[PDB]
Scaffold this motif. Structure first.
Motif, PDB file in Angstrom:
ATOM      1  N   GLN A 138      -1.497   5.036  20.287  1.00 46.35           N
ATOM      2  CA  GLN A 138      -0.360   4.760  21.142  1.00 46.35           C
ATOM      3  C   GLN A 138      -0.122   3.280  21.383  1.00 46.35           C
ATOM      4  O   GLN A 138       0.445   2.915  22.407  1.00 46.35           O
ATOM      5  N   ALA A 139      -0.612   2.454  20.463  1.00 48.92           N
ATOM      6  CA  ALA A 139      -0.380   1.021  20.502  1.00 48.92           C
ATOM      7  C   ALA A 139       0.117   0.658  19.112  1.00 48.92           C
ATOM      8  O   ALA A 139      -0.411   1.150  18.125  1.00 48.92           O
ATOM      9  N   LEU A 140       1.134  -0.197  19.045  1.00 47.44           N
ATOM     10  CA  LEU A 140       1.733  -0.690  17.792  1.00 47.44           C
ATOM     11  C   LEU A 140       1.325  -2.141  17.529  1.00 47.44           C
ATOM     12  O   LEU A 140       1.237  -2.921  18.446  1.00 47.44           O
ATOM     13  N   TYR A 141       1.001  -2.441  16.281  1.00 49.33           N
ATOM     14  CA  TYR A 141       0.599  -3.799  15.864  1.00 49.33           C
ATOM     15  C   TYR A 141       1.279  -4.187  14.570  1.00 49.33           C
ATOM     16  O   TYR A 141       1.603  -3.324  13.754  1.00 49.33           O
ATOM     17  N   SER A 142       1.494  -5.495  14.367  1.00 46.99           N
ATOM     18  CA  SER A 142       1.912  -5.947  13.069  1.00 46.99           C
ATOM     19  C   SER A 142       0.645  -5.735  12.208  1.00 46.99           C
ATOM     20  O   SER A 142      -0.406  -6.255  12.552  1.00 46.99           O
ATOM     21  N   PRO A 143       0.746  -5.000  11.073  1.00 49.24           N
ATOM     22  CA  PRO A 143      -0.451  -4.739  10.254  1.00 49.24           C
ATOM     23  C   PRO A 143      -0.904  -5.934   9.488  1.00 49.24           C
ATOM     24  O   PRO A 143      -2.030  -5.979   8.985  1.00 49.24           O
ATOM     25  N   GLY A 144      -0.015  -6.898   9.339  1.00 53.72           N
ATOM     26  CA  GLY A 144      -0.371  -8.073   8.557  1.00 53.72           C
ATOM     27  C   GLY A 144      -0.613  -7.707   7.105  1.00 53.72           C
ATOM     28  O   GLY A 144      -0.013  -6.740   6.541  1.00 53.72           O
ATOM     29  N   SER A 145      -1.545  -8.424   6.503  1.00 56.61           N
ATOM     30  CA  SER A 145      -1.833  -8.250   5.121  1.00 56.61           C
ATOM     31  C   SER A 145      -2.448  -6.896   4.769  1.00 56.61           C
ATOM     32  O   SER A 145      -2.472  -6.560   3.602  1.00 56.61           O
ATOM     33  N   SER A 146      -2.897  -6.132   5.766  1.00 57.17           N
ATOM     34  CA  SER A 146      -3.359  -4.769   5.494  1.00 57.17           C
ATOM     35  C   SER A 146      -2.237  -3.937   4.853  1.00 57.17           C
ATOM     36  O   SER A 146      -2.501  -3.171   3.947  1.00 57.17           O
ATOM     37  N   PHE A 147      -0.977  -4.204   5.226  1.00 59.71           N
ATOM     38  CA  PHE A 147       0.181  -3.528   4.706  1.00 59.71           C
ATOM     39  C   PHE A 147       0.391  -3.724   3.229  1.00 59.71           C
ATOM     40  O   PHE A 147       1.071  -2.919   2.595  1.00 59.71           O
ATOM     41  N   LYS A 148      -0.178  -4.772   2.634  1.00 56.73           N
ATOM     42  CA  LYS A 148      -0.010  -4.988   1.225  1.00 56.73           C
ATOM     43  C   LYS A 148      -0.457  -3.803   0.388  1.00 56.73           C
ATOM     44  O   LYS A 148      -0.051  -3.614  -0.744  1.00 56.73           O
ATOM     45  N   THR A 149      -1.345  -2.998   0.939  1.00 54.49           N
ATOM     46  CA  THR A 149      -1.725  -1.798   0.249  1.00 54.49           C
ATOM     47  C   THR A 149      -0.509  -1.000  -0.085  1.00 54.49           C
ATOM     48  O   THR A 149      -0.407  -0.427  -1.170  1.00 54.49           O
ATOM     49  N   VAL A 150       0.394  -0.834   0.849  1.00 52.27           N
ATOM     50  CA  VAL A 150       1.647  -0.049   0.601  1.00 52.27           C
ATOM     51  C   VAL A 150       2.537  -0.760  -0.435  1.00 52.27           C
ATOM     52  O   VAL A 150       3.017  -0.156  -1.399  1.00 52.27           O
ATOM     53  N   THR A 151       2.718  -2.072  -0.283  1.00 51.41           N
ATOM     54  CA  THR A 151       3.530  -2.788  -1.278  1.00 51.41           C
ATOM     55  C   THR A 151       2.984  -2.662  -2.721  1.00 51.41           C
ATOM     56  O   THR A 151       3.717  -2.391  -3.691  1.00 51.41           O
ATOM     57  N   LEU A 152       1.656  -2.819  -2.863  1.00 49.42           N
ATOM     58  CA  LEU A 152       1.015  -2.730  -4.142  1.00 49.42           C
ATOM     59  C   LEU A 152       1.199  -1.318  -4.700  1.00 49.42           C
ATOM     60  O   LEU A 152       1.576  -1.154  -5.862  1.00 49.42           O
ATOM     61  N   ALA A 153       0.969  -0.314  -3.863  1.00 49.36           N
ATOM     62  CA  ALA A 153       1.105   1.104  -4.314  1.00 49.36           C
ATOM     63  C   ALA A 153       2.528   1.411  -4.790  1.00 49.36           C
ATOM     64  O   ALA A 153       2.742   1.925  -5.892  1.00 49.36           O
ATOM     65  N   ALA A 154       3.485   1.006  -3.993  1.00 48.03           N
ATOM     66  CA  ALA A 154       4.893   1.144  -4.354  1.00 48.03           C
ATOM     67  C   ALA A 154       5.217   0.424  -5.666  1.00 48.03           C
ATOM     68  O   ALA A 154       5.931   0.950  -6.525  1.00 48.03           O
ATOM     69  N   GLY A 155       4.675  -0.781  -5.834  1.00 53.05           N
ATOM     70  CA  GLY A 155       4.951  -1.535  -7.057  1.00 53.05           C
ATOM     71  C   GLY A 155       4.394  -0.891  -8.317  1.00 53.05           C
ATOM     72  O   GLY A 155       4.995  -0.907  -9.354  1.00 53.05           O
ATOM     73  N   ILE A 156       3.193  -0.357  -8.232  1.00 57.37           N
ATOM     74  CA  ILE A 156       2.592   0.267  -9.364  1.00 57.37           C
ATOM     75  C   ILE A 156       3.295   1.590  -9.586  1.00 57.37           C
ATOM     76  O   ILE A 156       3.612   1.946 -10.722  1.00 57.37           O
ATOM     77  N   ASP A 157       3.557   2.324  -8.517  1.00 62.56           N
ATOM     78  CA  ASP A 157       4.128   3.703  -8.686  1.00 62.56           C
ATOM     79  C   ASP A 157       5.539   3.735  -9.301  1.00 62.56           C
ATOM     80  O   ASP A 157       5.907   4.682 -10.025  1.00 62.56           O
ATOM     81  N   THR A 158       6.316   2.685  -9.071  1.00 65.43           N
ATOM     82  CA  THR A 158       7.633   2.616  -9.644  1.00 65.43           C
ATOM     83  C   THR A 158       7.609   1.972 -11.039  1.00 65.43           C
ATOM     84  O   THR A 158       8.652   1.637 -11.599  1.00 65.43           O
TER      85      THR A 158
END
Length: 410
Positions: A138-158
């Motif tokens: 119930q707390a929101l944070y900027s994930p920072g560079s942890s989010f790169k996991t999603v960017t990398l996954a999206a990049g490879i998957d497409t």
């Protein structure tokens, strides 16, 4: 009518965290008071309701209803067995001593929550006199560079990039008429994407985000759970992405590195919970299949198993082939990158570290799994840097995984 007894709340390994017992009326008792407080929850006029006490209220609870004297004789409450393991819980709670933040340990194949701890915490006893916030969900944070996991996954998957694809990673670079910078303005030259991920270069990963675009980035974030109130039997605030139609190129660039900088009617993003970060690590460890996490294993009759929770999927965010590439990139992070502090002798750990905008906040994140081949555990961590905690998320994460694996071996 506090004449109707409530069923107990117990850990998967048989530890009771909540009971009921009076000569008058029953009293709610909290053994090991302080253990998984946010998760166990409470019902307080002053402080509101939270956790299992609230969410499983009915479970915990005609002609006979008119008579108060009979409320207790007919029915007592059915107990609740959580997926939480008390030994893993104690490991996560010990790891947060002296810090503000949270930790989630989960099973990647099912989404079962094995440990969930927020700090600072409190005891039920203190309720009769920051701490109350559940920083795991119930707390929101900027994930920072942890989010790169999603960017990398999206990049490879497409199929728009590969781990051996090279990228320029200068200390600073102009994108969308704004500037993006690597941490400490470090110029890394031209390097492969797997190295840019391991050393966590913003300039390199921003380029991938720009190449994917807003629709893609958002679509993949949502496929991993953004926009969903995660949890089959517990409340989690949704992680947020903007409306892709409203994002700018510069916004996009930063969002792909985990920093929300947008300004428009829709929320800026990404904004994440620690549970969302666990869900993402689980999916990657689980061949791209996203599980809706859960914390209740089964309901017991005052006597006998009444029901058993069933694991459920939120879909497949990326292909298995993509999931194996991201796992391999996550192994590099820890073996030769920014997550070296997560290494534990005798066991292979993989993950992704995270740092936000060191603008004020010095929060440290880490998502990971172990063992690398055939993962059986995922960890998500935030350590809040109030007044410098660089790399602490990783150290906490590695230590938590190792101890939890030993508990699991027994």
């Amino acid at each position: 009518s506090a004449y109707v007894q409530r069923g107990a709340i117990i850990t998967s390994d048989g530890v009771t965290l909540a009971e009921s017992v009076q000569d008058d009326t029953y009293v709610r008792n909290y053994p090991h008071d302080g253990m998984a407080s946010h998760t166990v929850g409470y019902i307080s006029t002053q402080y509101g309701t939270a956790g299992i006490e609230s969410s499983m209220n009915e479970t915990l609870t005609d002609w006979r209803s008119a008579l108060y004297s009979m409320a207790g004789i007919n029915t007592t409450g059915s107990s609740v067995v959580l997926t939480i393991n008390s030994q893993m819980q104690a490991v996560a709670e010990a790891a947060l001593q002296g810090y503000s933040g949270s930790i989630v340990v989960m099973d990647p194949s099912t989404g079962a929550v094995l440990a969930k701890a927020s700090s600072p915490s409190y005891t039920h006893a203190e309720l009769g006199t920051s701490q109350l916030v559940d920083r795991t969900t119930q707390a929101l944070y900027s994930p920072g560079s942890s989010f790169k996991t999603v960017t990398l996954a999206a990049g490879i998957d497409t199929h728009k990039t590969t781990l051996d694809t090279t990228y320029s990673a200068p200390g600073t670079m102009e994108i969308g008429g704004g500037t993006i910078h690597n941490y400490a303005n470090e110029d890394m030259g031209t390097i492969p994407l797997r190295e840019a991920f391991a050393r966590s270069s913003n300039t390199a990963l921003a380029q991938l985000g720009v190449a994917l675009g807003a629709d893609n980035l958002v679509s993949y974030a949502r496929a991993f759970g953004y926009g969903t109130a995660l949890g089959q039997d517990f409340s989690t605030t949704p992680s947020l992405m903007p409306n892709p139609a409203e994002m700018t190129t510069w916004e996009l660039a930063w969002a792909s590195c985990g920093l929300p900088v947008g300004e428009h009617a829709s929320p800026a993003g990404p904004q994440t919970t620690v549970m969302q970060n666990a869900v993402i690590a689980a999916a990657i460890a689980n061949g791209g299949v996203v599980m809706n996490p859960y914390i209740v294993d089964r309901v017991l009759s005052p006597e006998a198993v009444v029901s058993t929770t069933s694991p459920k999927s939120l879909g497949q965010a990326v292909s298995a082939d993509t999931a194996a590439q991201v796992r391999e990139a996550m192994l590099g992070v820890v073996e030769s990158g920014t997550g070296m502090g997560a290494r534990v002798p005798g066991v292979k750990i993989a993950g992704k570290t995270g740092t936000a905008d060191v603008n004020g906040n010095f929060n440290s994140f880490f998502i990971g799994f172990a063992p690398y081949d055939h993962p059986t555990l995922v960890v998500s961590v935030v350590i809040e840097g109030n007044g410098n905690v660089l790399g602490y998320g990783a150290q906490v994460g590695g230590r938590v995984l190792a101890q939890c694996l030993n508990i699991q071996a027994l």
